[PDB]
Amino acid sequence: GDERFYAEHLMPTLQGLLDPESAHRLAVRFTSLGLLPRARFQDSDMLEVRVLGHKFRNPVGIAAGFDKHGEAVDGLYKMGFGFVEIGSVTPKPQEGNPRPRVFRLPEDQAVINRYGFNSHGLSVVEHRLRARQQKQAKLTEDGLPLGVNLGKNKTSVDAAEDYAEGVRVLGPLADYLVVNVSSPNTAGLRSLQGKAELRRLLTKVLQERDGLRRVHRPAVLVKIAPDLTSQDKEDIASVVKELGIDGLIVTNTTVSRPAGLQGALRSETGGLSGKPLRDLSTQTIREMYALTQGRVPIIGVGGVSSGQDALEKIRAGASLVQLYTALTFWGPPVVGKVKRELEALLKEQGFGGVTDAIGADHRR
Numbered sequence: 001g002d003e004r005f006y007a008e009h010l011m012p013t014l015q016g017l018l019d020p021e022s023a024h025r026l027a028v029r030f031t032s033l034g035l036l037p038r039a040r041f042q043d044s045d046m047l048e049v050r051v052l053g054h055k056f057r058n059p060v061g062i063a064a065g066f067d068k069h070g071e072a073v074d075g076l077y078k079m080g081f082g083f084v085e086i087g088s089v090t091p092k093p094q095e096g097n098p099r100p101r102v103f104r105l106p107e108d109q110a111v112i113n114r115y116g117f118n119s120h121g122l123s124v125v126e127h128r129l130r131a132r133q134q135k136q137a138k139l140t141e142d143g144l145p146l147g148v149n150l151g152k153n154k155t156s157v158d159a160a161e162d163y164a165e166g167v168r169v170l171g172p173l174a175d176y177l178v179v180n181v182s183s184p185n186t187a188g189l190r191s192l193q194g195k196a197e198l199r200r201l202l203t204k205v206l207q208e209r210d211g212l213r214r215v216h217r218p219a220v221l222v223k224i225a226p227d228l229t230s231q232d233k234e235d236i237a238s239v240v241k242e243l244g245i246d247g248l249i250v251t252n253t254t255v256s257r258p259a260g261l262q263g264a265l266r267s268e269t270g271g272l273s274g275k276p277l278r279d280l281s282t283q284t285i286r287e288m289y290a291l292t293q294g295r296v297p298i299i300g301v302g303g304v305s306s307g308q309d310a311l312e313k314i315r316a317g318a319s320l321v322q323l324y325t326a327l328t329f330w331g332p333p334v335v336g337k338v339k340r341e342l343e344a345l346l347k348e349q350g351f352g353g354v355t356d357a358i359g360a361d362h363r364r
């Protein structure tokens, strides 16, 4: 709905008026009510991707964290996303961290957040998704799949049981599930990425998933940090292949603060997202793709705000990409912008479609 107006006039006006959390809440409300122009960009056949046992009309999804509670799914498809991921959802409802807990860094086109898994909980989200389950079944059939991202409660003793509960409750409503072991905002969570902990956790998750009826049986992906050692990455790749994990989401936000950040709020605690994350995420995709021999589908995420950003991740090995932070600066028009630029670049670089470009850098 006109990039130039939103990017230069409307979005800076919303930014100037509202604190970032209030802006987020308003964005979810507006989106869920369908108060957005229905996006005019028609997805061309060259954007279609077949992966994770599904057809994706285009490879650009909304990352987890925007719609934590499954309130705005239909409005997100209307915005032009090829797939929607909701969550993270925790088993019991929980408030998350005290405010303020989200910070804009406009000079860096970055955000820092420390939400800490504010979640309505499995029960509430389950009912919300059940109320539109058949509509989603038709959307998925039409190439618009739904992912559900699972987290764990702050005070839970048994992390694996939290994730298992999510698989049992929301697995039947999802095209894919995400085991989020990479939030920087829940104490101890990232240690679940370690080899032995990950293996134990994912064995249980996969056992639970395999016990679901065939038509309600989702793909299972693991979402990983951009801050892992080489050893961590080798270990993850090994466990993923040992267990037959269906895919990886690469990456969550970073606890690093790259040299050069200008924002006044750069030293706030939390995960950093947006442009300063972009190439760190792209390099993690590149490494994970090589470690899995290109055989494990990757959803690439972190700092995507253009067609070039999307294509760099795809050529590095991503089958699909997501964005979030760019929406907070450019607004809804960024979605069509990314898709139009991606298509133009695929054509310029001689690819027949997205599928041909996946991992292309590794064959160079």
Ligand SMILES: Cc1cc2nc3c(=O)[nH]c(=O)nc-3n(C[C@H](O)[C@H](O)[C@H](O)COP(=O)(O)O)c2cc1C
Residues within 6 Å of the ligand: 063, 064, 065, 066, 068, 087, 088, 102, 111, 113, 115, 117, 149, 180, 223, 251, 252, 253, 273, 274, 275, 277, 301, 302, 303, 304, 322, 323, 324, 325, 326
């Ligand atoms: C405010 C905010 C909340 C987020 N919440 C979640 C979450 O609950 N679960 C999750 O897996 N990732 C979460 N993320 C991470 C995003 O899904 C994504 O991995 C990261 O922000 C990098 O993409 P981006 O640069 O396009 O935002 C959140 C990110 C932001 C900015």
Ligand SMILES: CC(=O)c1sc(Nc2ccc3ccccc3c2)nc1C
Residues within 6 Å of the ligand: 014, 019, 020, 021, 023, 024, 025, 026, 027, 030, 031, 036, 066, 102, 104, 327, 328, 329, 331, 332
């Ligand atoms: C953290 C976050 O999601 C919000 S979202 C946002 N701005 C808006 C504001 C309005 C929006 C309307 C539709 C879609 C996205 C929108 C984004 N700013 C922030 C800081």
Ligand SMILES: CCCCCCCCCCC[N+](C)(C)[O-]
Residues within 6 Å of the ligand: 021, 024, 025, 028, 068, 093, 094, 095, 118, 119, 120
């Ligand atoms: C019942 C447990 C309360 C969970 C509160 C989570 C915040 C409420 C709405 C979240 C919107 N966010 C703040 C995610 O935009």
Ligand SMILES: O=C(O)c1cc(=O)[nH]c(=O)[nH]1
Residues within 6 Å of the ligand: 065, 088, 113, 114, 115, 116, 117, 118, 180, 182, 183, 184, 185, 252, 253, 271
């Ligand atoms: O809820 C959060 O704090 C959160 C979760 C997550 O996975 N990533 C993130 O940046 N924030």
